[PDB]
């Protein structure tokens, strides 16, 4: 989680927000995915959120379901994803790497062993998509024992009890879906810095997030859409990813 603390400190010294793209690992294959990820960082991504393909995701929109199936159908496995993560970390010492996981893949061979493997490969945070704070105790405990930030979503429909729990239990960042008041209450309760992740697909939404006093913004699916649109041309895929990420990061500054 220290990579996030260091990143936000540095961004604060530059009065900049963070820009964080999501992609599915291994979409549309392992080699292209590694290139995509290097392109995102080179183009100015501050941190990454990376998904591990799962047979039956029940918490992702159509764009993401489509990407899940490209990777999953191409035979990408969690073991291969963890090989990828080690390689990504080896190339990029300071970039925070967050995973977006389904509970079964974390629970499968033991929750503690999962976080231990995260720590071994250099992952910084884990968001478990189908574990609400009420069920989070064993996950966040294993995360913290292995120096991994547990990320929680603060949804539109949050109440004060939820704000206090997310603020208390999360580390790294708060994944945020009135707005300026959620940001204010999270700060009051000493929550991890907020990243706005609701429908972030254009530069003006990044600047709005910064203006609202959020630490930055997460693009939950715009990067995946670009992959989906450019499958037939890998070169163009990288070019459009680079342009998009560059534009989005410029909006944070």
């Amino acid at each position: 989680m220290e990579r996030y603390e260091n990143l936000f400190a540095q961004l604060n010294d530059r009065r900049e927000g963070a820009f964080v793209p999501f992609v599915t690992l291994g979409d549309p294959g392992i080699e292209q995915s590694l290139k995509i990820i290097d392109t995102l960082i080179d183009a100015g991504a501050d941190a990454l959120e990376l998904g591990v393909p799962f047979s039956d995701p029940l918490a992702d929109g159509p764009t993401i379901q489509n990407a899940n199936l490209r990777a999953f159908a191409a035979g990408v496995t969690p073991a291969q994803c963890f090989e990828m993560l080690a390689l990504i970390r080896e190339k990029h010492p300071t970039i925070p790497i967050g995973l977006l996981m389904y509970a079964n893949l974390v629970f499968n061979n033991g929750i503690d062993a999962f976080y231990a493997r995260c720590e071994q490969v250099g992952v910084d945070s884990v968001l478990v998509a189908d574990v609400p704070v009420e069920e989070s105790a064993p996950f966040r405990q294993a995360a913290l024992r292995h120096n991994i930030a547990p990320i929680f979503i603060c949804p539109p429909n949050a109440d004060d009890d939820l704000l206090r729990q997310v603020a208390s239990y999360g580390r790294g960042y708060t994944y945020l879906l009135p707005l300026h008041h959620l940001i204010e209450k999270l700060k009051e309760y000493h929550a991890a810095p907020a990243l706005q992740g609701f429908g972030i697909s254009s530069p003006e939404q990044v600047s709005a997030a910064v203006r609202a006093g959020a630490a930055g913004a997460i693009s939950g699916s715009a990067i995946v859409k670009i992959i989906e649109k450019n499958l037939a041309s890998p070169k163009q895929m990288l070019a459009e990813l680079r342009s998009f990420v560059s534009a989005m990061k410029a909006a944070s500054r």
Binding site: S55, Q65, P78, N104, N109, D130, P132, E134, I153, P155
Partner: protein, 395 residues
Amino acid sequence: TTLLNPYFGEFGGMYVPQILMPALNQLEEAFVSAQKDPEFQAQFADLLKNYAGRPTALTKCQNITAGTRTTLYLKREDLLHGGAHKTNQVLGQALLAKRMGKSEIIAETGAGQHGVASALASALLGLKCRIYMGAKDVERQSPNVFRMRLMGAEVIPVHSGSATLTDACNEALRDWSGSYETAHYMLGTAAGPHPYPTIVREFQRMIGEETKAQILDKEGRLPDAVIACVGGGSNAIGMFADFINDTSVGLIGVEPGGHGIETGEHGAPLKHGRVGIYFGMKAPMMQTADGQIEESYSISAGLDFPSVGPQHAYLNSIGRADYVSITDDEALEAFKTLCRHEGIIPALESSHALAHALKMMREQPEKEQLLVVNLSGRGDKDIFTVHDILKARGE
């Protein structure tokens, strides 16, 4: 925080994205309130009786058990309106939707059986019903699609991901996460996140309560065992619930063995899978070594799923209920046997429960035993399946 315990031992819970927790908490509150409300109970009793036809008969077999010491009764959920026990709980959940001030129902369906049940409850109660169904499923299920549309439901083809059941379920839940103020998600078995396993049991428990009263009246004692097939767990937990505290009564759940457990083509996670977390719950599921959910298989679509509801896993763990499997071929023989000897065409789901009872009888024919089979549904829907199989192997 919840009003009721979301777990059965280690199994169950609420493993959903945070955004759906208020919806689950709302439903739990409404259910707890409804269960204390005599007027809700009276409205539910009225639908069950005057619309669905309860109580259901308890039929004594005679031809099937001749020359043995088994007395076998069938609890006739096949006679309920809609042809199966699913009707009971969709009516209750429809009333809960109205209690929460909602006029819309969301469901998903694969083979279409739960979709039809949802549509008929919604039609009766004047609710707007949308049913998500993977495009691949819509194309294969024209009869059930047509029945749902006749009942006024909107069937919404889902083309994303693999365009089958998981994708339909995802879309139904995405919808619900935005619409839960006005729409209720009608889960079709005793599984998924709390409070559904609890609600579904309580809205199916008349199966066992009636069975108990009927058996006492006819035999003057409780059954030696009650036997039910297990897809997600609803008919079986509805048969079992009223007998849980009668510790002399055996509770036997029958999972589909498919082509044989040893083949891996089965749907028997409770005895042959591994605990995992999916669809909102910690429960037994069929899994790959690396934690992907395996495809299940059964001749019977209603049993063909890779998981099971958590209260069954719990009852198993403590030894209160025992779980077994029956193969496609055993179920087929039971189907043929009931048609020929009792004039009842059972659902192939139910035929797995009947097959196990026939085995209890035939293996030990001088054992005195009073058995009740939960005949969850009728088998008109299965006659082509059975025909095709018998023809293929030359019968």
